[PDB]
A paper describes a structure:
TnpB is a RuvC domain-containing protein and predicted to be an ancestor of the Cas12 nucleases of CRISPR-Cas systems. Our biochemical data demonstrate that RAGATH-18-derived RNA (reRNA) interact with IS607 TnpB to form a novel programmable reRNA-guided DNase system. To the best of our knowledge, these IS607 TnpBs with an average size of 390 aa (330–433 aa) represent the smallest programmable endonucleases with activity in human cells identified thus far.
We determined the structure of a ternary complex comprising ISFba1 TnpB (D371A catalytic mutant), a 207-nt reRNA containing a 20-nt guide segment, a 36-nt target DNA strand and a 20-nt non-target DNA strand with a 5’-AGGAG TAM using cryo-EM at resolution of 3.0 Å. The structure revealed that ISFba1 TnpB and reRNA form a complex with 1:1 stoichiometry. ISFba1 TnpB consists of an amino-terminal TAM-interacting domain (TID) and a non-target-strand recognition (REC1) domain, a target-strand recognition (REC2) domain, a reRNA-binding domain (RBD), and a RuvC domain at its carboxy-terminus. The guide RNA–target DNA heteroduplex binds to the central channel formed by TID and REC1 from one side, and the REC2 and RuvC domains from the other side. In ISFba1 TnpB system, the reRNA plays a scaffolding role in organizing the complex via stabilizing the conformation of the ISFba1 TnpB effector protein for targeting the dsDNA substrate. The REC2 (residues R227, R230, R234, N238 and N249), RuvC (residues K299, N300 and R301) and RBD (residues K341 and K354) domains pack against the sugar-phosphate backbone of the reRNA at one side, whereas TID is anchored on SL3 of the 3’ flanking and 5’ flanking motifs of the reRNA through polar interactions via R130, R132 and R142. The 5’-AGGAG TAM-containing duplex is specifically recognized by REC1 and TID. The nucleobases of dG(–1*), dG(–4*) and dA(–5*) of TAM form hydrogen-bonding interactions with K83, N121 and N122 of TID, respectively. The TAM-proximal end (base pairs 1–7) of the heteroduplex is recognized by the REC1 and RuvC domains, whereas the middle portion (base pairs 8–14) of the heteroduplex is bound by the REC2 domain. In this regard, our structural observation revealed that, as compared with Cas9, the reduced contacts between RNA–DNA heteroduplex and the REC domain of ISFba1 TnpB support that ISFba1 TnpB may target a dsDNA substrate stringently despite its miniature size.
Residue numbers in the entry: 4 to 387
Amino acid sequence: LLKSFKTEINPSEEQKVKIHKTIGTCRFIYNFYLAHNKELYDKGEKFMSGKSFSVWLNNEYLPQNPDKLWIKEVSSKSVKHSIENGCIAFTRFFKHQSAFPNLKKKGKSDVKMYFVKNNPKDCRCERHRINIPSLGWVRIKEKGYIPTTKDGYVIKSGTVSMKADRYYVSVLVEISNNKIANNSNAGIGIDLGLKDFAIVSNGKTYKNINKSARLKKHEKQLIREQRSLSRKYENLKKGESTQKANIQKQRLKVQKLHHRMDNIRTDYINKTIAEIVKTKPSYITIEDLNVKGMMKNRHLSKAVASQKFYEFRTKLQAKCNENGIELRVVDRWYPSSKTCHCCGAVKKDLKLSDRIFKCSCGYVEDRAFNAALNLRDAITYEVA
RNA sequence: GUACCGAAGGCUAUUUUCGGGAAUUUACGACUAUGGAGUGUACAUGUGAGUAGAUAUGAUUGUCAAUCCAAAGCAUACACGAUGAAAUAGUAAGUAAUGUUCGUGAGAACUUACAUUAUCUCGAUGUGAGUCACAUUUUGAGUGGCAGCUGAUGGUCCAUGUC
DNA sequence: ACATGGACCATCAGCTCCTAATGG
DNA sequence: CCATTAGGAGCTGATG
Ligand SMILES: [Zn+2]
């Protein structure tokens, strides 16, 4: 049972400069490996495998030119990890799993630094502070939410990140699973929609978190901040005052607003899944929703993006696999929103803008409720 | 002491706490020195436009025919503003006392006591001395009530502005 | 069509051994 | 000298 415990940390200035330098070197190494591979193909030679690119770097390039040996000044493990995940892009493009590599490009916050447990005595953790191989003891803001070494827990590896003025660490731990739950309640089903987040085939209704006053106020604030930030770029285009500081401040503010909205939405999804799973059903059937096609509709794109259907599905699948539940999903073209629950009529004149379902037998119910009931008693499905 | 901003890892708290605090009620966080006229709202007003976009909805061999359907911008209305808007460059966001130095300024550093989650603080239990020490302890905890499975690669969408 | 600078979407995986240097 | 802590090599054979 692989897990992760992502927590915010408290580096010092000397540790902050180390983190920044390591990330910069890793980005440079990724780009350099890509370019050298391109040049080799241009000539007509074979493919360098990354594990051999490192050997070429250590024994055939770095001695040759003494100009750039700052590479062996930052941790030698993060550099190797960056090279390997650069070669993973190529090995995924050779197979038809992905597209051609993409040249990380200077300046973002998506590149992290990787550390591993090398010796039998590092990566020791307490209620406060953790020991990371590149930096030493690093303080931890939240106490107890990282498996300590006092109570027989071991960290395999980890990653240090940086998002909007804050720093985080994410460590992965093998967890033993106990308390085998016995599921015996009647099964349920949930329909995912845009008027409400979810409607369950038992009566429970979860409203759209995006239709609340707080999120609307946040969106207004974000639009105002973006409009104010775009004036500084226009001003910068004219003069020669290239010492942008208010631009950095505005960028930080925009990133903070985005992060806050993400926090609200993620908390809502996690708590909703918690309540649904704690209700303890035997099985649940959901859908095979296609979000790309729905997002191709211009007037539905923003709402569908802000609803986060696929993330909810993945987290629900993880929790179901963890709690011993079974997840059922149906075909992409299963007639859920058109089939009556009494006679089985598959009426076709159902307009997309009707909130009430009415067929010939006289059955009348909400469209979402009818869809949830159709989902709960589905016959053909394949378990996720 | 309201809307907002900083901190207490995240969400929430009308009856959690410590600070700053308005262009003041679907309510443009506050000051500093230059800078001189704009900035904000229309989720409680029209046109762009049945237009872009989507259709496991029908007919002939890409059109026809039915069902849902934007946004930018322009135009209007209202609000605040020469008691100083945008932009540029900075300052602070635990409490008291004393006296210097530094900066144009908001302010900062060096001393004292308090408070506080100071690479730890607290609780509990046991032993010993006469309230203080030494050990063990996460099934103990970090303002209440609640939840946290991350990384890599690629793809696709979105917002703001100029022409 | 350029820049700005974000988010979510699908699918696939999560590091060991041996040597060689560092502080009193 | 010495428990610690760092570095170098490893596979994969492929229409940037
Ligand atoms: Zn019927």
